[PDB]
Amino acid sequence: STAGKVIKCKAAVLWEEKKPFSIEEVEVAPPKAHEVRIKMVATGICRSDDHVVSGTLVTPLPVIAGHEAAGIVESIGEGVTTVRPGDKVIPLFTPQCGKCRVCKHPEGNFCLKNDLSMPRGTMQDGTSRFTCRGKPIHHFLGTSTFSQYTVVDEISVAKIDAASPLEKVCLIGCGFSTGYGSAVKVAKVTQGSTCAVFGLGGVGLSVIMGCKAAGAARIIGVDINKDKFAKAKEVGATECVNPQDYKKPIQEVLTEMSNGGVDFSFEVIGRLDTMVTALSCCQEAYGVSVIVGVPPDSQNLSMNPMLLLSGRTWKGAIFGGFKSKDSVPKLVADFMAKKFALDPLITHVLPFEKINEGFDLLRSGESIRTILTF
Amino acid sequence: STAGKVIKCKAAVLWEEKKPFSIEEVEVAPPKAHEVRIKMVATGICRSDDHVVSGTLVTPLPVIAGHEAAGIVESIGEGVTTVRPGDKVIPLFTPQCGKCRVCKHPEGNFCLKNDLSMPRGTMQDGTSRFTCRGKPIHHFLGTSTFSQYTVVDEISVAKIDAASPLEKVCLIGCGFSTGYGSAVKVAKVTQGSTCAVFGLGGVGLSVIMGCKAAGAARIIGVDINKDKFAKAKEVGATECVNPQDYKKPIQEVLTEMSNGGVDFSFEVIGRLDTMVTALSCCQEAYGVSVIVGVPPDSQNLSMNPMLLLSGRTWKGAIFGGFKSKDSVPKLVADFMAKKFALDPLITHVLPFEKINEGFDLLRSGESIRTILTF
Numbered sequence A, B: 001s002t003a004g005k006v007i008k009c010k011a012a013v014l015w016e017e018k019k020p021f022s023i024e025e026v027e028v029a030p031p032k033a034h035e036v037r038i039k040m041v042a043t044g045i046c047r048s049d050d051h052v053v054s055g056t057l058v059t060p061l062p063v064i065a066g067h068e069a070a071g072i073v074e075s076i077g078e079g080v081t082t083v084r085p086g087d088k089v090i091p092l093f094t095p096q097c098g099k100c101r102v103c104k105h106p107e108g109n110f111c112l113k114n115d116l117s118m119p120r121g122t123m124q125d126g127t128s129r130f131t132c133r134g135k136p137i138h139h140f141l142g143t144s145t146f147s148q149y150t151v152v153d154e155i156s157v158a159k160i161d162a163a164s165p166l167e168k169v170c171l172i173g174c175g176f177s178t179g180y181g182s183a184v185k186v187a188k189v190t191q192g193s194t195c196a197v198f199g200l201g202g203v204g205l206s207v208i209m210g211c212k213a214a215g216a217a218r219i220i221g222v223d224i225n226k227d228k229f230a231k232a233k234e235v236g237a238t239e240c241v242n243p244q245d246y247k248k249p250i251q252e253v254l255t256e257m258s259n260g261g262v263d264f265s266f267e268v269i270g271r272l273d274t275m276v277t278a279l280s281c282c283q284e285a286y287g288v289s290v291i292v293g294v295p296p297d298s299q300n301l302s303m304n305p306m307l308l309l310s311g312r313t314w315k316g317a318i319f320g321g322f323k324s325k326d327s328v329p330k331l332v333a334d335f336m337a338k339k340f341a342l343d344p345l346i347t348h349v350l351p352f353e354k355i356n357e358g359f360d361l362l363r364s365g366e367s368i369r370t371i372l373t374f
């Protein structure tokens, strides 16, 4: 039995940028008040985890990364009321404290307790539950799912259906919910509209799924890797374009294709140039562009504000605009009720021990989501 | 007595940037098919007219500027159905053709027949109705209201109430409707919200009027000219701040004053730096910022897209988002029913012949709106 005890388990530690993960024994402290210790069952490889490796997304190192996952509660600290030992759960990389001005706002979801704006790499109490070779190891986004066991704050975990298939619903922890919500909740895609989706990875395919669910008439996928096109069409793209195939800039191509600009565009890559292209390709008077891709650390884009003065709307969001703890259990219930599909996003299933091979698949352009199984 | 004839009249011709207007005789051709010739009664001096002088807003020279006005139809060309001789009218610097994809869209107002995005300085048929010293003179935004007579396309004029006071309702042709609609229609300011308004000229005061009409609890005016604060408070500002008074950047000041950022911000100046500051000061998760000011020609701003990724919305608009021909007569009717006030915007009245004194008053910081009478 493990409750109240330190657990020694396997985790993938990132000791420094631009190095493979190190799969080795860590010590996981028991949960303190209002904390939850979770036995991991499955975790996805999101491009944002790779951003930690590449230094695109700055967070304190050394670190246990991973934020898209599902598992089973091993133990709860004093005062926890929302989960119990044995519950299936999804860690929430965007917390929902329920008390801050954002949590109380009808349209806010980026809870002020988040660790994304100004990353500390700790629990809410400013300390770590992880050690490795006698050194403290940082948390990542209050989740740290590349470990057989993690500890999260109560505001960073949701209880989900006991009959949930965790090797699929882990994607509701990041990529599916982000993309789908970016379409249905943040953009509010309309029936009969034309959409353009820049980036056809796991998150961009989930944007397509949402645009199709919202009734878009046309969904134009845009990627420099034409190997991504077939799956984009399977989940709802009506046509795909590779910017490398054209002499003109792709904003001009998309404006022409849409007879004067698209209704909704999405940047789902993480490049400054594609954020400006995606804004420019939406109709100048009434178009909406949503930034989903995480930009490179501390870099500014350049744009002409006449793009906005004519009437465009530009916005971004974390986690598809979903209030995380309210939404994740409902999304899982909706998946159980066959309201959407997750299998199209899953190209590879590997044991956790093959994490580096999973990242190599993403980096090579050869995967959408790899699910790692513990 | 002038129908079908060239009219010789006085106009204010701008021959050169950064020079006084020349009040001199022009020839005004009669209206062609679907054109309307208007005897001007009153015209306001909007900062955008000054932008033509300063080269902030590029349009071909020589030009008859003026776009905020009211007058009486002198004659109509063949096929005109929406106005008749003797009707009171407001020229529409944003047309409403009723046929393009923007005019058909429920939100859109920036009709594709506009002359603002890529100014040519002509009528819709690519020609000019004005001659001066035997030389063709450009139009401005299809209106050219700094003339005793102008000719406009039918899609650029609205019939208004016969009992309208033209020396007041000319402001519905630009500055009032722009500011008021930017608050009520484009931002959709909510009851109990906190708003920040950058720039307290005629347009920014109109934004304040709209925020107060929408029920905002706090309306923070921001201007480097503290002489602007008294009138801002009269029309609904709850407090005013001068960035020059503070050691810290004003986005930090406003974030602190609003206990974490404002609900709605407005840039009503025309500076790249204040567009970014106004975005930054709205709450990072659910804030909305609206660009109203006209930026300097062809210049790009620099910004960090993490400001949007957290959840901010950034938009801009022309003419307050109003569909011009539908909306102007209704706004006049509402004014006549005392639903809003225009007198707080009018600080000076001059004859048209004193147009250069009117521009001196604007440039010195003294005026809000000067109304010129023909």
Ligand SMILES: NC(=O)c1ccc[n+]([C@@H]2O[C@H](COP(=O)([O-])OP(=O)([O-])OC[C@H]3O[C@@H](n4cnc5c(N)[nH+]cnc54)[C@H](O)[C@@H]3O)[C@@H](O)[C@H]2O)c1
Pocket: A045, A046, A047, A048, A051, A174, A175, A178, A198, A199, A200, A201, A202, A203, A204, A222, A223, A224, A225, A228, A243, A268, A269, A270, A271, A274, A291, A292, A293, A294, A295, A317, A318, A319, A320, A365, A368, B309
């Ligand atoms: N906002 C959020 O909450 C959130 C959540 C999840 C992911 N993200 C970010 O979203 C982005 C996509 O994540 P993902 O789907 O896991 O990544 P991914 O699987 O790497 O997909 C990115 C796609 O972009 C394509 N691409 C690369 N460069 C270009 C280019 N110049 N033009 C067009 N296509 C290009 C690329 O070929 C790939 O298919 C990353 O930046 C993530 O960090 C954000």
Ligand SMILES: NC(=O)c1ccc[n+]([C@@H]2O[C@H](COP(=O)([O-])OP(=O)([O-])OC[C@H]3O[C@@H](n4cnc5c(N)[nH+]cnc54)[C@H](O)[C@@H]3O)[C@@H](O)[C@H]2O)c1
Pocket: A309, B046, B047, B048, B051, B174, B175, B178, B198, B199, B200, B201, B202, B203, B204, B222, B223, B224, B225, B228, B243, B268, B269, B270, B271, B274, B291, B292, B293, B294, B295, B317, B318, B319, B320, B368
């Ligand atoms: N979008 C549209 O349809 C539309 C319509 C009408 C006017 N405009 C633009 O809106 C802007 C305002 O027009 P207006 O009200 O006639 O002009 P205005 O009367 O010149 O007012 C601008 C105000 O900005 C103040 N100001 C200048 N610099 C700063 C600074 N750094 N920080 C804070 N305040 C500052 C200034 O003191 C003045 O009171 C101009 O750029 C116009 O061209 C746009």
Ligand SMILES: [Zn+2]
Pocket: A095, A096, A097, A098, A099, A100, A101, A102, A103, A111, A112, A113
């Ligand atoms: Zn919160």
Ligand SMILES: [Zn+2]
Pocket: A046, A047, A048, A049, A067, A068, A174, A175
């Ligand atoms: Zn992610």
Ligand SMILES: [Zn+2]
Pocket: B095, B096, B097, B098, B099, B100, B101, B102, B103, B111, B112, B113
């Ligand atoms: Zn139109």
Ligand SMILES: [Zn+2]
Pocket: B046, B047, B048, B049, B067, B068, B174, B175
């Ligand atoms: Zn104006």
